[PDB]
Design a protein around this ligand. Structure first.
Ligand SMILES: [Mg+2]
Ligand SMILES: [Zn+2]
Ligand SMILES: [Zn+2]
Ligand SMILES: [Zn+2]
Lengths: 128, 1187, 118
DNA sequence: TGCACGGCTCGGCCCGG
DNA sequence: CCGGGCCGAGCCGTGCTTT
């Protein structure tokens, strides 16, 4: 047994989406690049993946069906690996809500509920 | 004096700190031995006593060496052992063997493994055929092929001395012996290796008929001679180890061998000495060129073969190639070259830091290092402009527009490389380090003011000089401090040349002697007639500021401007030459005041100097040729199939020898292994501790004949011989083991459950067949590291030299350096800044970042081992690669049996291992393409064992049987004794270069490492000539490593050859390449019609296929060994080369017939059944035939 | 600068994948009438010709005529990333980069560099 | 001693029936 | 939604001018 726990972190931006969109976006980023960048602004969530030469751009708005809501304390952006993201996001259901919290160059937190009471949480570290 | 002693004391302290923990862990009885199996030495005598013995010889070796020397001491030790004062041994052959081993260990400093591996046996044989008299024979094994020419020659010499001292007659062969030896030499040359040497039959006959000993040994290759059944020899196959010592030993090292003999004062080899003796008006620059061509003739042996994908960077001694510069940089000099990173970039990054290239003049081979204080290429862009790309960023920026490389750049080659190879000095091109000496001398001779370059001068002299020359004193100080970076403006250089009377500054000298005087006459006429120039003034000196001439009027004289290396630009149909480079061209020509006229038997510079008042020196007169080979390397070490634990599994694991998979399926494996028995209860298995009671067990000795088992205590009483029989016992026997139970016990022991794969070995190659604990394998698998034959983890990398460094290059703070021990900089001032230059201590190393990444995993594995398997506190406690600074390693060369300790101080971002030249010499390495290993000290201490070494013959090569804790420059090597350690070469050297002298005539004018030997100042103060901004600046990976296909490789290589002006691709490159593809095409085509079919299930090979069609006595099909696609894999590239370039008709017809021959052989098996829609795919064969 | 809209990106992906099996590089000719392609395989045994007039396209907008070349593998992968009911959009600006966007449940745009083919 | 071809086996994806 | 087909990986092999 090894004890580890992280205190509550100040998460400037918080967005809840569906599993399918994140799954496809991670797949595309892996197709082009090796890392992903999570950028969110007022009523707008976008996720990019810049390859050596190619480019991928996915953007969404609260008015879109992909997102359910957004609340951005201030401008935010960060990057994470693609291997771990593909490992954890795989197996997500289509009709599943996923809550994502992240800020500036600090670990992202993803979580979703099991039968309205269970819960599974991930804590992905940043790059650089 | 005292800092060196403190340094060595700290090293010993850290070594003791590691050794204590290694001893504590090993005493718990979980390993093959109850103590560490790597003793530590301090000097040559200790290494010799450890490696070969006999005991107590260390004191005698020390005293004799201090009295007489090395050779006399070795021979006196031979005599002392022969007399038998170290204890009775036995027969005569025992005495001879012991004496030869000890002596050959003494003479080679006891590093290489020749005394232990090369010499297999010494025996006395009778000359039965003629006289029956006795003579001595030496048996040589395979590992003698690696020792070296000097080692082989000294082995032969010491054998001859011992046999002379033993009262044995000379060896006397027959004529059939000579004929068989000649045939063996020829067969080895034509079937095994080129030997890098090939003596003539007469020379070999002389040697064989004059060699007083029998140079023989067992078979090593699968080839049989025709002169069969020669008496006195127990084999009819190739004895490679016996002939290598003859060819590359005494014969190839005659000069050094005879020098050694003369030093020893032993006679009888006068024939070899005699063999060695038998083997033994006009303008100034016109004459100099003639004489230079007469004496130093171009060499071509380096470019006799070009492979596909490895470019040729210059033709032999062709202008426009590598400009020779005499000097030694911070990180070059041992055998390496200094290169500008801009030239690395502008050749498509085929050159990277640490890439080897086969050179022409000084030696054969070198490694490239970045030097930013020398010049880069001069290129011609796609719009017709000329540029001087002396900067790395500019090279990155303008790489796309480059159309031709007019000049390639400089190469800095040390004076100690010319002394080593005995090469006549080539004339020196004019440079800044020569101009500064002339400037200082003239100032002193005219004004009586004393100044010195590259150092600090008194203020009064600076004020006097500045007042006399009327310039800024600060500028004078700066220019004298770093003449290679600070240069005066062109007008000031002209003023200096007017006042003092010295040639023009070498920066503003163009390549005048690269054009003919008639071309300069034409250009002078054009400039005088149709050019518009703007003049200036400076202290009564008029110089040009701009030249504008229309392109149409200039005509075909634009090539003269390009061959002079003159930067200009083209705009609106005009050619413009700008401020610094208008006076560079017009001042030598007298500002168009005296007409330029050609003369016979004169050069351009001769006419300029005869007519002009400001003199010039030839900026480029010596060029070198080089070619690519052997990219760099900083990779790990793995066995042919990767292994993680030294545990036999057999075929129960599959092709990949997966122990975990075999354990899962409940399989039972039968393999040869060693069992141990617990004395108390009676547990038996392949373990060192009994699980029930945890007490050390005893090895079981088994009689092969009746399978009786005897514990270690019992077998000792029986002398390891069965009582019921009369045969020797064995420590092992074929046995059955269940992997599941053992793996589960190991997993429970270390608490490591998630490991998916665990690779093992098919069978153990040692004579004990002891297995390694499975816990170590599990921890290795968990931490992702691999094991080596002796039970250690190793990392291989190319090696480069370094003597001074900057704290900023290696990313270490000044406070950390002060903690490590560094306090001053190389000039004596305190260390306070990270931009200063600090001298490196002899045993401090600078690893790469790949090495750091791998050694982090190794450190984690060692910490886990200590915490889990042994129950001791962790040692390294590292989370990032920079937590390893201050920790020791072991350096080891692949052909030696002794290592040396080193300390980590920083990391760079290249793929080489930087270290002091003494460190590389201590491993007997030359630093011109060699690769060596490193391992953490504690890992080797805990893991290395002598019971895991293969028993074949060379299982002891490349193993740390002993480690050296101190470094002594007097006994590391002999090539590093020629390195130069001066801050700058004197004027006398530069003036003597023009006389084409030899380096030995001026060896006392330039201080070398040899001059300081013995005195305390051989670790203390060494210096360099050229500085460098960064030591790891430039491309880090060769482009050769990211090309996939052979056609793509050849295409890129040919494009590079096209760009460079001094290569001449158009036929030479393609012909030399075709003589690398044609041999493959023809050899594979011939070998197809006489192949040998093999069975895909077994490995039995049949001369001709079975009539049935399937392997009898097997259940598998029959396959080919030379497929159809193996013949014609290089046909497309060969056709491209023939059709795109200018090759002789002979080669074109050869290729056109080869295609037809490939097509015609398969006419009845693969008929051309498919028609095509379109034809004429740019074929050259059909066109040639039709014409 | 053109704006081409195609419904059912899956059928377009299938068509391009079928075309790309034999050949490696091809140049697409686009004019005021439609898109046409033609090439021959390296073995000189198959010739494939394809045309797509403006009638099939839901929205077509082209000025003049141009030929656009690109690697078949990367285009095939990007099209394979499409779905059954999405609408494919081929658009380009002055910059010589081919921008492909698929607008279904969400909008995703890829960039595919151009290449010149004889 | 690095490269180039050609027989297995052996899992991870996929796609359609 | 369960199963074939296809495609890397990873082991064992060969072979590298010659009247
Ligand atoms: Mg070497
Ligand atoms: Zn027991
Ligand atoms: Zn017996
Ligand atoms: Zn068979």
């Amino acid at each position: 047994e090894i004890e580890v726990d992280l205190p509550e972190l100040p998460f400037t931006a918080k967005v809840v989406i569906l599993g399918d969109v994140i799954k496809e976006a991670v797949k595309d980023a892996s197709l082009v690049s090796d890392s992903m960048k999570f950028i969110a602004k007022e009523n707008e969530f976008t996720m990019r993946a810049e390859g050596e030469t190619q480019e991928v751009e996915v953007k969404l708005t609260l008015e879109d069906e992909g997102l359910l809501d957004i609340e951005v304390q201030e401008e935010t952006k960060s990057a994470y690996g693609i291997s771990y993201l593909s490992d954890m996001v795989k197996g997500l259901g289509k009709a599943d809500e996923v809550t994502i919290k992240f800020g500036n160059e600090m670990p992202m937190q993803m979580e979703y509920y099991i039968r309205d009471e269970g819960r599974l949480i991930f804590l992905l570290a940043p790059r650089v | 004096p005292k800092e060196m002693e403190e340094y060595f004391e700290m090293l010993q302290r850290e070594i003791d700190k590691a050794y204590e923990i290694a001893k504590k862990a090993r005493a718990q009885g979980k390993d093959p031995s109850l103590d560490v199996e790597i003793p530590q030495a301090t000097d040559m005598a200790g290494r010799v006593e450890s490696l070969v013995g006999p005991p107590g010889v260390a004191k005698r070796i020390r005293e004799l060496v201090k009295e007489y020397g090395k050779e006399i001491a070795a021979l006196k030790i031979v005599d002392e052992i022969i007399e038998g004062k170290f204890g009775d041994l036995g027969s005569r052959e025992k005495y001879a063997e012991q004496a030869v081993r000890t002596a050959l260990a003494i003479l080679t400093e006891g590093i290489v493994s020749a005394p232990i591996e090369g010499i297999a046996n010494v025996k006395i044989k009778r000359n039965t055929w003629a006289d029956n008299s006795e003579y001595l024979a030496l048996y040589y094994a395979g590992p003698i092929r690696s020792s070296g020419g000097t080692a082989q020659a000294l082995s032969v010499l010491v054998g001859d001395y011992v046999r002379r001292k033993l009262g044995l007659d000379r060896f006397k062969p027959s004529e059939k012996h000579i004929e068989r030896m000649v045939e063996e030499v020829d067969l080895y040359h034509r079937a095994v290796t080129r030997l890098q040497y090939h003596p003539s039959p007469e020379e070999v006959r002389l040697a064989m008929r004059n060699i007083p000993i029998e140079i023989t040994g067992e078979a090593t290759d699968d080839v049989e001679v025709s002169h069969r059944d020669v008496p006195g020899v127990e084999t009819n196959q190739l004895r490679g180890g016996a002939i290598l010592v003859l060819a590359e030993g005494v014969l190839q090292k005659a000069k050094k061998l005879v020098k050694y003999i003369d030093k020893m004062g032993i006679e009888g080899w006068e024939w070899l000495k005699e063999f060695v003796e038998a083997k033994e008006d006009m303008g100034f620059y016109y004459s100099l060129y003639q004489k230079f061509k007469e004496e130093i003739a171009p060499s071509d042996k380096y470019a006799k073969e070009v492979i596909g994908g490895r470019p040729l960077f210059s033709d032999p001694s062709k202008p426009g190639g590598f400009r020779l510069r005499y000097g030694r940089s911070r990180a070059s000099g041992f055998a390496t070259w200094g290169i500008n990173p801009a030239t690395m970039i502008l050749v498509d990054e085929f050159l990277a830091i640490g890439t080897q290239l086969k050179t022409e003049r000084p030696g054969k081979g070198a490694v490239v290092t970045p030097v930013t204080t020398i010049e880069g290429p001069i290129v011609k862009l796609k719009d017709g402009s000329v540029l001087r790309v002396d900067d790395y960023n500019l090279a990155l920026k303008v790489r796309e527009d480059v159309e031709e490389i007019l000049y390639l750049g400089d190469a800095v080659i040390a004076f100690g490389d010319f002394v080593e190879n005995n090469q006549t000095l080539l004339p020196a091109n004019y440079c800044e380090e020569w101009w500064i000496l002339e400037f200082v001398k003239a100032l002193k001779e005219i004004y009586e003011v004393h100044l010195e370059p590259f150092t600090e001068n008194e203020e009064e002299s600076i004020e006097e000089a500045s007042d006399y020359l009327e310039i800024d004193p600060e500028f004078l100080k700066e220019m004298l401090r770093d003449p290679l970076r600070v240069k005066p403006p062109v007008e000031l250089a002209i003023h200096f040349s007017e006042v003092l009377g010295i040639p023009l500054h070498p920066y503003y000298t163009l390549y005048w002697n690269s054009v003919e005087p008639k071309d300069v006459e034409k250009l002078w006429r054009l400039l005088k007639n149709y050019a518009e120039i703007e003049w200036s003034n400076f202290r009564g000196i008029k110089f040009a500021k701009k030249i504008v001439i229309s392109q149409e009027k200039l005509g075909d004289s634009k090539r003269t401007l390009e061959l002079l290396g003159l930067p200009h630009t083209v705009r609106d149909g005009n050619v413009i030459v700008d401020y610094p480079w208008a006076a560079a061209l017009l001042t030598p020509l007298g500002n168009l005041n005296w007409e330029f006229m050609a003369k016979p038997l004169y050069a351009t510079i001769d006419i300029i100097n005869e007519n002009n008042e400001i003199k010039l020196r030839d900026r480029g007169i010596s060029w070198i040729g080089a070619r690519m080979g052997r990219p760099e390397k900083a990779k790990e070490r793995k066995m042919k199939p990767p292994v993680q634990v030294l545990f036999p599994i057999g075929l129960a694991g599959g092709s990949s020898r997966d122990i975990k998979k075999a354990a899962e399926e409940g399989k039972v494996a039968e393999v040869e292994i060693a069992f141990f028995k617990c004395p108390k209860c009676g547990h038996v298995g392949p373990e060192h501790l009994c699980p029930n009671c945890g007490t050390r067990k005893e090895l079981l000795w088994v009689c092969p004949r009746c399978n009786a088992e005897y514990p270690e205590s019992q077998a000792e009483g029986y002398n390891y011989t069965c009582p019921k029989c009369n045969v020797k016992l064995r420590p092992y026997a074929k046995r059955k083991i269940r992997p599941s139970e053992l793996l589960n016990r190991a997993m429970e022991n270390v608490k490591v459950y998630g490991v998916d794969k665990l690779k093992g070995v098919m069978g153990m190659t040692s004579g004990w067949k002891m297995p390694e604990p499975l816990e170590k394998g599990l921890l290795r698998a968990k931490n992702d590291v691999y094991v080596f034959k002796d039970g250690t983890i190793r990392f291989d990398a190319t090696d480069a030299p370094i003597t001074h460094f900057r704290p900023r290059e290696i990313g270490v703070s000044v406070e950390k350096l002060r903690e490590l021990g560094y306090t001053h900089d190389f000039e004596g001032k305190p260390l306070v800044s990270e931009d200063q230059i600090v001298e490196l201590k002899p045993q401090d190393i600078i690893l790469s970042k790949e090495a750091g990444r791998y050694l982090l995993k190794v450190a984690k594995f060692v910490d886990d081992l200590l915490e889990k398997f042994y129950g001791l506190p962790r040692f390294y406690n590292a989370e990032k690669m920079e937590d390893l600074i201050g920790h020791l390693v072991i350096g080891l060369a692949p052909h030696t049996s002794a290592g040396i300790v080193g300390r980590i101080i920083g990391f760079v971002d290249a793929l080489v291992g930087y270290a002091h030249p003494y460190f590389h010499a201590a491993k007997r390495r030359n630093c011109d393409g060699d690769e060596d290993a490193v391992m953490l000290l504690l890992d080797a201490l805990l893991n290395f064992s002598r019971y895991y070494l293969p028993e074949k013959r060379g299982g002891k090569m490349d193993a740390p049987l002993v480690i050296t804790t101190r470094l002594d420059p007097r006994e590391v090597d002999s090539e590093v004794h020629n390195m130069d350690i001066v801050r700058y070469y004197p004027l006398e050297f530069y003036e003597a270069t023009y006389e084409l002298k030899s380096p030995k005539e001026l060896v006392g004018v330039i201080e070398r490492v040899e001059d300081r030997l013995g005195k305390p100042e051989m670790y203390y103060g060494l210096k360099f000539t050229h500085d460098t901004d960064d030591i790891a600046l430039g491309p880090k990976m060769s482009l050769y490593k990211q090309l996939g296909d052979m056609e793509e490789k050849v295409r890129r290589q040919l494009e590079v050859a096209k760009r460079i002006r001094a290569v001449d691709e158009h036929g030479v490159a393609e012909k030399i390449l075709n003589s690398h593809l044609i041999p493959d095409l023809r050899g594979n085509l011939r070998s197809f019609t006489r192949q040998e079919f093999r069975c895909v299930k077994c490995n039995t090979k049949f001369r001709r296929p079975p009539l049935n069609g399937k392997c009898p006595v097997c259940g598998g099909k029959i396959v080919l060994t030379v497929s159809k696609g193996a013949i014609e894999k290089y046909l497309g590239t060969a056709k491209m080369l023939v059709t795109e370039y200018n090759v002789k008709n002979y080669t074109r017809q050869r290729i056109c017939l080869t295609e037809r021959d490939i097509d015609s052989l398969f006419e009845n098996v693969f008929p051309e059944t498919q028609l095509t829609l379109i034809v004429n795919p740019n074929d050259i064969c059909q066109r040639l035939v039709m014409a | 600068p053109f704006e081409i809209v195609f419904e059912g990106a899956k059928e377009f992906a299938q068509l391009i994948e079928t075309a790309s099996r034999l050949i490696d590089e091809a140049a697409f000719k686009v004019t005021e009438e439609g898109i046409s392609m033609r090439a021959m395989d390296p073995s000189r045994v198959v010739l494939i010709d394809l045309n797509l007039p403006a009638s099939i396209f839901s929205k077509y907008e082209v000025d003049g005529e141009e030929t656009i070349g690109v690697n078949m593998d990367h285009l095939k992968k990007v099209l394979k990333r499409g779905k059954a009911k999405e609408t494919l959009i081929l658009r380009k600006g002055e910059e010589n980069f081919l921008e492909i966007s698929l607008q279904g449940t969400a909008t995703r745009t890829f960039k595919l560099p151009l290449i010149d083919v004889e």
